[PDB]
PDB file of C-alpha atoms in Angstrom:
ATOM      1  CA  UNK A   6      58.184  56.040 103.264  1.00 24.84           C
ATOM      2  CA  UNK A   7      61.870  54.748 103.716  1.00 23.88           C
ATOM      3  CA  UNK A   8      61.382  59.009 105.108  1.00 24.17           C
ATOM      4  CA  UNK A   9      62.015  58.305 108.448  1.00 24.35           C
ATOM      5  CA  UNK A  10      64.796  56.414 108.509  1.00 26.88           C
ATOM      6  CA  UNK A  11      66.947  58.743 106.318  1.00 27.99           C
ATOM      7  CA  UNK A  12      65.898  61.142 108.570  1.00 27.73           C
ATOM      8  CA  UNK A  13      67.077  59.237 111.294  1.00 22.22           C
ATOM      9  CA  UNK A  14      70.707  58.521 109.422  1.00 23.95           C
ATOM     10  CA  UNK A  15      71.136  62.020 108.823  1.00 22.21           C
ATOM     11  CA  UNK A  16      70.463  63.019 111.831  1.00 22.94           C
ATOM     12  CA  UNK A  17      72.895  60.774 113.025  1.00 25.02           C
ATOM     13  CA  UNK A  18      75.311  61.649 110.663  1.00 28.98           C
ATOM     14  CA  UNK A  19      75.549  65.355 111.861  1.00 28.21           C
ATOM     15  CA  UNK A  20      75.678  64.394 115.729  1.00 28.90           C
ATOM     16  CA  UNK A  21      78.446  62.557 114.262  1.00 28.13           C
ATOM     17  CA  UNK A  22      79.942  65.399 111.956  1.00 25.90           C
ATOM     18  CA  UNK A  23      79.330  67.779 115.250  1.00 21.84           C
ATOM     19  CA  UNK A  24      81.767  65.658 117.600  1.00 19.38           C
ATOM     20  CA  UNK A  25      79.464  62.474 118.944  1.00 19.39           C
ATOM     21  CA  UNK A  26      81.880  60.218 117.478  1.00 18.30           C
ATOM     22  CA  UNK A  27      80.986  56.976 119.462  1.00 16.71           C
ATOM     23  CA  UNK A  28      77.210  57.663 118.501  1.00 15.06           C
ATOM     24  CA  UNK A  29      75.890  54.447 116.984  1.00 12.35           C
ATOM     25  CA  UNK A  30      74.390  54.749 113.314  1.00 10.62           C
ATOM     26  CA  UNK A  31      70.953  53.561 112.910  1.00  9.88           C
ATOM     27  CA  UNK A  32      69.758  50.905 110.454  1.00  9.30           C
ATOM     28  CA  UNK A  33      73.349  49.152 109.182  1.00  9.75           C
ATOM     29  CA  UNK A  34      71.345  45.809 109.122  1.00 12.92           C
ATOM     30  CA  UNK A  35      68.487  46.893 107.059  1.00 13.61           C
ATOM     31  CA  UNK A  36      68.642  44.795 103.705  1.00 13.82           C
ATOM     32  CA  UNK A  37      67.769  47.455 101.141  1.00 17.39           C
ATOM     33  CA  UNK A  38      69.518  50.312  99.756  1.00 15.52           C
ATOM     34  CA  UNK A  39      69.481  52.093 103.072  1.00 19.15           C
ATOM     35  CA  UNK A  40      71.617  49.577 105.209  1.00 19.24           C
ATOM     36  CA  UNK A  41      74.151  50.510 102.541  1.00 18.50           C
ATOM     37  CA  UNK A  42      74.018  54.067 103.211  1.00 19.23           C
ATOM     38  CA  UNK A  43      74.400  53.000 106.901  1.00 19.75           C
ATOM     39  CA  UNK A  44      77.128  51.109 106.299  1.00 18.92           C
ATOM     40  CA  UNK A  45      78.574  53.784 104.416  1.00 15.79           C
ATOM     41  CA  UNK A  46      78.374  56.633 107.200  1.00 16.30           C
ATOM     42  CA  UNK A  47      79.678  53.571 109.811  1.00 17.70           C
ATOM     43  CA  UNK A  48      82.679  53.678 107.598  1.00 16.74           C
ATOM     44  CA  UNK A  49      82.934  57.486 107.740  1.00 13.83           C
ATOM     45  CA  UNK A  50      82.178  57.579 111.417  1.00 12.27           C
ATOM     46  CA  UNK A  51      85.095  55.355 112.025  1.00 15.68           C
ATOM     47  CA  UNK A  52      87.258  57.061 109.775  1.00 16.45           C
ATOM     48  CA  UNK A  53      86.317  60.416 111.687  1.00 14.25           C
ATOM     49  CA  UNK A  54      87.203  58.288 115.055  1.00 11.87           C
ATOM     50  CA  UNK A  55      90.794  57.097 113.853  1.00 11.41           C
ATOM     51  CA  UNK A  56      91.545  60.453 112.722  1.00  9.48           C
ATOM     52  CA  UNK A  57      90.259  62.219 116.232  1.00  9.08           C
ATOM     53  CA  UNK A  58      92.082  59.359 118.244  1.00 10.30           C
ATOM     54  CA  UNK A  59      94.885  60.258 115.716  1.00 14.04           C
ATOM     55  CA  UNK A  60      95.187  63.785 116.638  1.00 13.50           C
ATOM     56  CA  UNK A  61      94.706  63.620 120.248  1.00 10.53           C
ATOM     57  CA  UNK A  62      97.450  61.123 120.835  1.00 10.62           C
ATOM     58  CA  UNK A  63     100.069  62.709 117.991  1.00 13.70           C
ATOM     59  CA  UNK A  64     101.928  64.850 120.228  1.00 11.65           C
ATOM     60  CA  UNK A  65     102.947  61.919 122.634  1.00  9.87           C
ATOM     61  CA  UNK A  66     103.846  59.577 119.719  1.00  9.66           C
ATOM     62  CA  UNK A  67     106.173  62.416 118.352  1.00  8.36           C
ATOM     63  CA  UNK A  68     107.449  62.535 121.934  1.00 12.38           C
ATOM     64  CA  UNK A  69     108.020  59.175 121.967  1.00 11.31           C
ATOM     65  CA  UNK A  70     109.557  58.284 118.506  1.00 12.18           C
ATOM     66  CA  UNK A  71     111.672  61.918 118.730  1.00 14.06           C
ATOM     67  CA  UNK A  72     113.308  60.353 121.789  1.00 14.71           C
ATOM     68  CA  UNK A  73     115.049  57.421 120.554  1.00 15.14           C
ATOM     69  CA  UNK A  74     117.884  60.024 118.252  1.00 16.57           C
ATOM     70  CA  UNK A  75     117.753  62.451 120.327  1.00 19.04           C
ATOM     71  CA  UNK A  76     119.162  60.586 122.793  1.00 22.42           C
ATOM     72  CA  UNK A  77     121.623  59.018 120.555  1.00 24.47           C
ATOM     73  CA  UNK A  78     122.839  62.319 120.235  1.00 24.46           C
ATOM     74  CA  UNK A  79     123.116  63.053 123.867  1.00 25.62           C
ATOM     75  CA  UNK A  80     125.172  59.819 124.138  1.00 24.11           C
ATOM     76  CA  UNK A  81     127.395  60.915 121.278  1.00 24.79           C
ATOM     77  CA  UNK A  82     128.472  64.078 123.207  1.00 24.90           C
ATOM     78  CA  UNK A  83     128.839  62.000 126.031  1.00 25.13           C
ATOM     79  CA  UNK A  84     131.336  60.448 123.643  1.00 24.22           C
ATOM     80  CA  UNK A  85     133.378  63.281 122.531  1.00 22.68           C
ATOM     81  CA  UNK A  86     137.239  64.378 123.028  1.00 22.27           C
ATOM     82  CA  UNK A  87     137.884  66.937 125.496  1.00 20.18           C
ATOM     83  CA  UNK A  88     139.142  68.927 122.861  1.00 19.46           C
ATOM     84  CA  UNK A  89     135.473  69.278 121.213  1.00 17.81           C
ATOM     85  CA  UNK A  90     133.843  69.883 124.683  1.00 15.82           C
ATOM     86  CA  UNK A  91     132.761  73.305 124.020  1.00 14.61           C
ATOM     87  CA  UNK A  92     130.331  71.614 121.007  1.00 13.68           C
ATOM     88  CA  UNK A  93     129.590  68.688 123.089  1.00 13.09           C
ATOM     89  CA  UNK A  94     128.046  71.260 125.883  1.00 12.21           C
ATOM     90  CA  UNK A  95     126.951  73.050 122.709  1.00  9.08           C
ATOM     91  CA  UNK A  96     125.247  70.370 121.068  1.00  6.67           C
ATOM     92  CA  UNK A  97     123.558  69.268 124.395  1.00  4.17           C
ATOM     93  CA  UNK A  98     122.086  72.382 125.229  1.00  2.71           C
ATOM     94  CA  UNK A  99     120.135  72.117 121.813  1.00  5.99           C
ATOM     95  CA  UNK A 100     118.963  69.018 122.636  1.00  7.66           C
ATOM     96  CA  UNK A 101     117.660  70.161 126.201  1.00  7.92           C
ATOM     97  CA  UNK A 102     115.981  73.022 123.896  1.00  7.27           C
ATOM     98  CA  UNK A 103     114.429  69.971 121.293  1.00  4.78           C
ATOM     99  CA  UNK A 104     113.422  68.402 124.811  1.00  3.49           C
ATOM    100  CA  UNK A 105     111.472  71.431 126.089  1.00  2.87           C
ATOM    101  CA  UNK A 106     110.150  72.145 123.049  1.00  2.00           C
ATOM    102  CA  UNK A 107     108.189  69.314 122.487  1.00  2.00           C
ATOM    103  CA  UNK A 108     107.385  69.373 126.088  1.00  2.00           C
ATOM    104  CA  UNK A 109     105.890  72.426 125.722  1.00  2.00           C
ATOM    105  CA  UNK A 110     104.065  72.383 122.677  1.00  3.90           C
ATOM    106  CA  UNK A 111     101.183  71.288 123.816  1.00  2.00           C
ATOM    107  CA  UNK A 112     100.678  74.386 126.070  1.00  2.00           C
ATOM    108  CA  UNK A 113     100.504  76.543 123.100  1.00  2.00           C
ATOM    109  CA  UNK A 114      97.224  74.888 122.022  1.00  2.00           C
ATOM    110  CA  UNK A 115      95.879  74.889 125.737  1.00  2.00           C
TER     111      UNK A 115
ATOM    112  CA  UNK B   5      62.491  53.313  93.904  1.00  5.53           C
ATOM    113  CA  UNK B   6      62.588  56.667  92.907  1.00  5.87           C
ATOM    114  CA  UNK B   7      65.230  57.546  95.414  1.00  6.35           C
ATOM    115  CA  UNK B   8      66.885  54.666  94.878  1.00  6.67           C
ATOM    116  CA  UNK B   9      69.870  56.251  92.406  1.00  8.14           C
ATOM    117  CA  UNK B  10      70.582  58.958  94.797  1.00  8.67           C
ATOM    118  CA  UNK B  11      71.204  56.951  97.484  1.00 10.21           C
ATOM    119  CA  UNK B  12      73.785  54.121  96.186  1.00  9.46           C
ATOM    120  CA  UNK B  13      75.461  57.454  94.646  1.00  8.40           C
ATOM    121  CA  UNK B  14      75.750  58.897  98.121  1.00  7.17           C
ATOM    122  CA  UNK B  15      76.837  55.937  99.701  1.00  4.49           C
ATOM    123  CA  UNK B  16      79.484  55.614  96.899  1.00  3.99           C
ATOM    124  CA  UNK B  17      80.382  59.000  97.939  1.00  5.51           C
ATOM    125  CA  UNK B  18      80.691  58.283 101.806  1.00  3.27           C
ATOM    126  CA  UNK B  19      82.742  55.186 100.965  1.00  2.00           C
ATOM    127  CA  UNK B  20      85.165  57.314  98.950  1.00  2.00           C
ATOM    128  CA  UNK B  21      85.557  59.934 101.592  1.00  3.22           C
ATOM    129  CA  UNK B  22      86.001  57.229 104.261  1.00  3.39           C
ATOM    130  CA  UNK B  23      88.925  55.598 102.089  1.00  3.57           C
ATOM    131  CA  UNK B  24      90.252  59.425 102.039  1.00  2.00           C
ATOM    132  CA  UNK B  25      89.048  61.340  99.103  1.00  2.92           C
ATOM    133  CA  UNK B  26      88.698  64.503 101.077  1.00  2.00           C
ATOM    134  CA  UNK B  27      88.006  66.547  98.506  1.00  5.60           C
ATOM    135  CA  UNK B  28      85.076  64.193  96.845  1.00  5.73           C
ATOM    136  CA  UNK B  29      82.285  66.106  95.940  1.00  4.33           C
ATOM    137  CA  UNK B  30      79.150  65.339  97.935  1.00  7.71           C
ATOM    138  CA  UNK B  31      76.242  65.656  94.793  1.00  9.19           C
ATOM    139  CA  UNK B  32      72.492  66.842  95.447  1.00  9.91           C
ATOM    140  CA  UNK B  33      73.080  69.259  98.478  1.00 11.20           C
ATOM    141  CA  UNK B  34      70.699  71.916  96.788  1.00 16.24           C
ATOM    142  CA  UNK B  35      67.425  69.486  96.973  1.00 14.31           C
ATOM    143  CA  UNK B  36      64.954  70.135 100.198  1.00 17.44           C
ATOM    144  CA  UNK B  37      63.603  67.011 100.101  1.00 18.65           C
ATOM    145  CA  UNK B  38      65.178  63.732 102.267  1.00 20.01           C
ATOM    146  CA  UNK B  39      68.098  63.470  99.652  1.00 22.11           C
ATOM    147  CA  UNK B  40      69.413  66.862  99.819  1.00 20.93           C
ATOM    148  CA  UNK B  41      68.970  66.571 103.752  1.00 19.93           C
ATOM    149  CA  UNK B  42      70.701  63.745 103.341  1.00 21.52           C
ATOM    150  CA  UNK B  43      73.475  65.222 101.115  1.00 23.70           C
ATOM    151  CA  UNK B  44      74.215  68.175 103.641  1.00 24.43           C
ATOM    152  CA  UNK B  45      74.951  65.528 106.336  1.00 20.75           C
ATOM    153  CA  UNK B  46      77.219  63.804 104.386  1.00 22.86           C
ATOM    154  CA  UNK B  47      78.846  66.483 103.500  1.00 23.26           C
ATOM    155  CA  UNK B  48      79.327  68.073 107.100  1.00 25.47           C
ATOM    156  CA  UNK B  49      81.138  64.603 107.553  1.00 25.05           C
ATOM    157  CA  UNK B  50      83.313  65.541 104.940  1.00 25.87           C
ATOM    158  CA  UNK B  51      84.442  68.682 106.085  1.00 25.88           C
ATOM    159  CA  UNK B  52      85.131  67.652 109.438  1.00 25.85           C
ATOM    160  CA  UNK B  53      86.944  64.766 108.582  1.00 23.81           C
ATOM    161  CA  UNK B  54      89.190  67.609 106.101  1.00 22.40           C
ATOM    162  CA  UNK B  55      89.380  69.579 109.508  1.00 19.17           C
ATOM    163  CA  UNK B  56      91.102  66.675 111.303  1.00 22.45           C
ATOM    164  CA  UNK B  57      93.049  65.859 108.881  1.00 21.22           C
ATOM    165  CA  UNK B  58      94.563  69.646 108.397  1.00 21.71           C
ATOM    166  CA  UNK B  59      94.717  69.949 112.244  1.00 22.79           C
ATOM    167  CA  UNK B  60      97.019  67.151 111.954  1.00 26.21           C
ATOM    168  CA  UNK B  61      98.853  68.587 109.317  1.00 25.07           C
ATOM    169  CA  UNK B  62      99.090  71.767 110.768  1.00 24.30           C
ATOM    170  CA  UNK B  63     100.434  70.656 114.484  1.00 23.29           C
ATOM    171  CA  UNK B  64     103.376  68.506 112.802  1.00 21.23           C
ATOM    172  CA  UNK B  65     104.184  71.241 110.430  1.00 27.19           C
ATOM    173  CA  UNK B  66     104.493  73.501 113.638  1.00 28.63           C
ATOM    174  CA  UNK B  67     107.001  70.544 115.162  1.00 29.94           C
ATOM    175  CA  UNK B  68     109.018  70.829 112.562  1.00 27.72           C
ATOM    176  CA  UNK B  69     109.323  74.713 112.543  1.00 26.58           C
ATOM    177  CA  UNK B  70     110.242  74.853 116.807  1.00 27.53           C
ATOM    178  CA  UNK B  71     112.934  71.615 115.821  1.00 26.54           C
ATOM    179  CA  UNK B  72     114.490  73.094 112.797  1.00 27.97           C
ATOM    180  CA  UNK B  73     116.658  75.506 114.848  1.00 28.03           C
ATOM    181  CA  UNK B  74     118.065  73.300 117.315  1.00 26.06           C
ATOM    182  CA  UNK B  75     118.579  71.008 114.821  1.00 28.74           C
ATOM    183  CA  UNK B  76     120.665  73.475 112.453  1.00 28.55           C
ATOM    184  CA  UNK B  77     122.380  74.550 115.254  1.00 27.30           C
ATOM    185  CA  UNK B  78     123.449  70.461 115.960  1.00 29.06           C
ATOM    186  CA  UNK B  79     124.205  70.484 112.278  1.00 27.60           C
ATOM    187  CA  UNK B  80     126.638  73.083 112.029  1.00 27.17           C
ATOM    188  CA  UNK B  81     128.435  72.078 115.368  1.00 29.01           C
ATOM    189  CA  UNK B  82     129.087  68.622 113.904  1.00 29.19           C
ATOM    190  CA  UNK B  83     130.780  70.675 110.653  1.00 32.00           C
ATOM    191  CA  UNK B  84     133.505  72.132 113.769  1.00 34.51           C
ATOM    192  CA  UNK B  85     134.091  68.465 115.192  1.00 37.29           C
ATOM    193  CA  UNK B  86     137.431  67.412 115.391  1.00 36.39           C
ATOM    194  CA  UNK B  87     138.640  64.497 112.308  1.00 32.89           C
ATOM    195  CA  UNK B  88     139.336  62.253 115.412  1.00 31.57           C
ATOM    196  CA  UNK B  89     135.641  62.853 116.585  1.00 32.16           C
ATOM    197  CA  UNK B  90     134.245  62.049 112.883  1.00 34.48           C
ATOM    198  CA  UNK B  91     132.416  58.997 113.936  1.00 31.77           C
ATOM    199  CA  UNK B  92     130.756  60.945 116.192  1.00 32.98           C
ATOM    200  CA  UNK B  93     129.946  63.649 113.883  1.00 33.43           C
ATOM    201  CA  UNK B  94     128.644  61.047 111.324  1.00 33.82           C
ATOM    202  CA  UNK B  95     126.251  59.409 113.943  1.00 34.84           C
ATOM    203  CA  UNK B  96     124.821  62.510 114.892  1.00 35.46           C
ATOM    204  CA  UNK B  97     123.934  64.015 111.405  1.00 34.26           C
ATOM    205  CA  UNK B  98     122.246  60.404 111.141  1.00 37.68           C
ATOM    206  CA  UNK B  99     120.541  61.086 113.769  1.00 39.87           C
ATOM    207  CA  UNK B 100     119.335  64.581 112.914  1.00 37.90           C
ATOM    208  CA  UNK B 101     117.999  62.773 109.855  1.00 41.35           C
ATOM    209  CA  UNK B 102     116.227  60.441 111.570  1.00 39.44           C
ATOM    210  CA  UNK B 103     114.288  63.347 113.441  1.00 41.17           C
ATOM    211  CA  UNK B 104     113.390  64.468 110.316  1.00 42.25           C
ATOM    212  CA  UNK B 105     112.167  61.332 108.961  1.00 42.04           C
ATOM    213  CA  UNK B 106     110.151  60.450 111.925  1.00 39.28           C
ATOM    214  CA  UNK B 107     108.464  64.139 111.079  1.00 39.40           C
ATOM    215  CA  UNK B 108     107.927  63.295 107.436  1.00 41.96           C
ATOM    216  CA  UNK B 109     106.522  60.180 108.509  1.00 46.01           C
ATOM    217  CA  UNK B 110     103.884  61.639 110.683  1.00 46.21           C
ATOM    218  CA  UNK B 111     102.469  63.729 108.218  1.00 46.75           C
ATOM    219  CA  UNK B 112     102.500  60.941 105.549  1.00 49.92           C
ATOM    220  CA  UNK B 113     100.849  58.763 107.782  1.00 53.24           C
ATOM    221  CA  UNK B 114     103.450  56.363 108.318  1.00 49.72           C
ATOM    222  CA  UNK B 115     103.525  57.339 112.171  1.00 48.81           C
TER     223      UNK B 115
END
């Protein structure tokens, strides 16, 4: 009927579903009710790529953004009176300890 | 057709999951025939798009638990700092709330 192609989509939609995020959805350019559907799954697939992409790359984007005040706070020790060097050292080693904690996060998971 | 209905209402489901209603609910998964085969897809799409997004959830919300020590600890040292050293002080509790607003932002999305 139209059978075979909603077969086909749904197919399609659990290779997706399963992890084949890059596969290519059959039948977006039909011009009846199941080209919407297509287009509908096309918008989940990519929504289901963004948010894979997402979480793959999150770690080094917390990495990254973390780094900007946590060095501010490095320089600030760098900044302060010998008389508050024992929380300047103090204050630093907690930042080496953020540092190596985000550095090893990732290991956790691995 | 026939078929036509479900369909379009599927499709109006998909689009709403895609835009991020995670918790939609996908209709006609208990039919055999092409719709409900249909149906189950769609909603296997939905749940692993929920698992993503509580993965995310999950690994930022474990960030912020390893930080939040190290980060109290900065907090109280600041409270010891000398008055002459109060600039400094001030800059760094800005910055230890700038580490916490990059988290937030991550798990809103902003990030």
């Amino acid at each position: 009927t139209i059978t075979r192609p909603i077969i086909e989509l749904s197919n399609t939609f659990d290779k997706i579903a399963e992890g084949n995020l890059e596969a290519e959805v059959p039948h977006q350019n039909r011009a009846d009710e199941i080209g919407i559907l297509a287009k509908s799954i096309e918008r989940l697939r990519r929504s289901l790529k963004q948010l894979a992409d997402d979480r793959t790359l999150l770690m080094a984007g917390v990495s990254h953004d973390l780094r900007t005040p946590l060095t501010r706070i490095r320089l600030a020790t760098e900044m302060m009176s010998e008389q508050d060097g024992y929380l300047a050292e103090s204050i630093n080693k907690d930042i080496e300890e953020c540092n190596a904690i985000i550095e090893q996060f990732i290991d956790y998971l691995r």
